[PDB]
Amino acid sequence: RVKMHVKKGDTVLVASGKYKGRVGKVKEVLPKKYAVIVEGVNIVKKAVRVSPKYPQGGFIEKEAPLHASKVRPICPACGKPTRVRKKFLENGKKIRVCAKCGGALDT
Amino acid sequence: VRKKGLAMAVADRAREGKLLLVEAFAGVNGKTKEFLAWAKEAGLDGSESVLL
Amino acid sequence: PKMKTHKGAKKRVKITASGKVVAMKTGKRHLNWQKSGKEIRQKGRKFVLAKPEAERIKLLLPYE
RNA sequence: CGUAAGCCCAAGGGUUCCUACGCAAUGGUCGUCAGCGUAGGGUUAGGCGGGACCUAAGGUGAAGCCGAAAGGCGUAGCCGAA
RNA sequence: UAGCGGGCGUGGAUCCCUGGAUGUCCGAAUGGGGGAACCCGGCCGGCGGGAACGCCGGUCACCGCGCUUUUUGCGCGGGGGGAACCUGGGGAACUGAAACAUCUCAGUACCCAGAGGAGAGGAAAGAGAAAUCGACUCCCUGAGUAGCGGCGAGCGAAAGGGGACCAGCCUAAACCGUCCGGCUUGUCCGGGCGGGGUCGUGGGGCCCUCGGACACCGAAUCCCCAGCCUAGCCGAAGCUGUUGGGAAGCAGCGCCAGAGAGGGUGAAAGCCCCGUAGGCGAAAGGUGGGGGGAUAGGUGAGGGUACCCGAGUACCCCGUGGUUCGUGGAGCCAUGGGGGAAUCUGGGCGGACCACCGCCUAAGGCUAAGUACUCCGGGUGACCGAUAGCGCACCAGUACCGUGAGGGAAAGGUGAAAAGAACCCCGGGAGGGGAGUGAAAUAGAGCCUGAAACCGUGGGCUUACAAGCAGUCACGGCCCCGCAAGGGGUUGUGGCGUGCCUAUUGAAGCAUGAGCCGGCGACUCACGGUCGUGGGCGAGCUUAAGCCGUUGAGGCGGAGGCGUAGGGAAACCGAG
């Protein structure tokens, strides 16, 4: 329900601070808690070495989430904002004085 | 009483001379731009105020 | 809200145009027979003063 | 102790029962123990009890009779017990 | 909110919006019963081998209105809720009068009944004095005036003037007919229907003559549509350096604006995000007199007749209520017992009563709006900040208490992020101690910021021949900063000294209240007065409701108030 923010499902930069000015993967969005995960927040998590899912010293982590509005879209340019447009056959949403958004599927 | 106020208000302003009475304007249409330019033409820099 | 203005107050006394409460002499309805006409003549009017100030507060709204 | 302090019934309480694990809190101290926490489990009916049987004081209540109202009384009928 | 886990989607899902289906047992409860949420039966279709027993579906409550062959069914409606507000029938007491009866609180609290986005009210048998008015209701006004009153406490009108909205209608009667019923056939006693008719310088009826029409007026009712809310969609501008865990901050150079409201982003931004102003959007649903079509409907002038115009009535008595009228010289309005009429020479009324003069047509029923309320949807606040604010921010009408009615809490903050601590070590665990997580672990998990009492580890000073509201003055020593000269903490001696509050004729009192600390907790406001003051005007001065406007914008509005003369109880006179 009108839960429309910004970030979607392409690949894009970091404008926060931890790893500001960096870039990462598809971005696997989750969820309404305004969290997005490119590759940014990487940590090293404990998890008891319990012989099941953990060897003789589990202590590993990878993708830890990070807030949405702390990232930004980049077009073949630098990193400028977005903007929509109706194709009279779909819904395109390019970039500030640029073309294309997240519609390389035929959009 | 309050009417004096009205009068006296402007009166003080007029006692200073900060009131312009242009018949119309040069920034006729609705644009921040043209009013800004006209504000150069009136010299109303960027450190004043408009009960306008 | 709004003062009640006393009915009796106006009903028996008047404050003259001076903030001076003036009206009635007391004592004539059972007097008589052995009454000298001297006092019946002096039972004409009176004057009142002092506490009559509070009496001016009584009437209030219409004054009178 | 043993006309009980032992053993049945009944109203009551609402899973305290059995079994395993376990003590930080509940036991006027402890506590490896429990009417304590926790999980799996246990309550079987044509003849016992009770209704698809009966009436009691009483309740109820078409009709009736009455009351400013809400209601009050109330026949037949229906509810009512260990 | 995860977790053993397993699906799901651009052949467009979760998701919100509308419409339908679906909804087991209770609850007015409705087959009947009943200790609500459970039990039992009839009656048509069915299910199982299915008559034994079972289930499922349909259907079975009374109340009222109109029909229907009174017989039997159908027919439209009824029952319960609701935060406040509303109409009616009931209705107090404290308390005010410094006591108490009249009076008062008060026709308020509550009891009940009923109607709804409203109510009730509402077409004058009125008003009031002018030959002036013209449905009902709300705000201002008049006015705390007119009066009511143990003439006490106090209670408190209407007309008029200003705004608010603005609506006016239909039956019974006389005339005439159609069906039915009875009947002392009779120019016939009633019920239904049918046209007829609705008024106050009187209307209606009948005959009759002026002349009566294609017309004039137009609904409160049904339809058409703009519109309004139930999902939404668009939306203008940024980049390097730099300290810092963190940049948005500070530096440099801009950009946008009909949009620099605000929230968020690891700090404090119009340009990073959601937004902003500005401007668009509904298949279905609701809503809709905002703008439109039509239907039911409504419009005459004269002459005589004397047919009609609301009956247990009007009026009279008795016993009342209401009005400001407490019985007053006591009317008007409505009504409980009895007495008991007229249709326009009948009549009710202008406050006993009468002459007169004006006003109004009762004894039948409907009517939007202007007003009110706040469960609810939005906005807004010189509103509160987790003892405050709804009683509750949080798992509250929950714990708990009570037979029941009912009472009624306590409890919010880790961090930007869970990264919420793997390993080892002591340890039975409980909890710690290195490591590691982050800016910070002085953020370690009821953890922000942790104050006060409060217990305690260590250190400095002094205390075992002393009699004390616990301090103050000075001297002195002991311990620590200071360049010196000065400062600090402590206490050996001695000069001195009856805690605090309240309450008193008077307290240290053997009067009074406080264990300690923490939070809360007590001179407000609205209206009318009276006085002083800072002001504007000033022989005048100022508007109330409301109209228009504005989003934190004012103006318009002279109705009304105080002022100019007072004196007398009054007529009435007048600087007397």
* A106: Cβ contacts below 8 Å, ≥ 6 apart: none
Q: State phi, psi for C22 to the nearest 5 degrees.
A: -135, 135
d(CA B6, CA A101): 57
Calculated CA dihedral for residues A19, A20, A21, A26, nearest 10 degrees: 70
| Buried residues in A58-69 as b, exposed as e (16+ CB within 10 A) | beeeeeebbeee
Chains that touch B (3 or more CB pairs under 8 A): none
CA of C39, C1' of D54: distance in angstroms: 106
Strand E bases contacted by the protein (CB, 7 Å): 10, 12, 15-16, 144-145, 147-149, 151-156, 231-239, 244-247, 257-259, 264-266, 271-275, 416-423, 436-438, 526-531, 535-537, 542, 554-555, 563, 565-569
Task: Sort A101 into a burial class: Cβ within 10 Å, 0-12 / 13-18 / 19+.
Answer: buried
Strands (E) in A8-49, as ranges, are 12-14, 23-24, 35-36
d(CA B17, CA A54): 83
SS3 A69: helix
- A 10 A CB-CB count for C24 gives 13
Residue A80 beta carbon within 7 A of nucleic strand E: yes
Sign of the four-CA dihedral A41, A43, A48, A50: positive
| Buried residues in A4-21 as b, exposed as e (16+ CB within 10 A) | eeebeeeebbbebeeeee
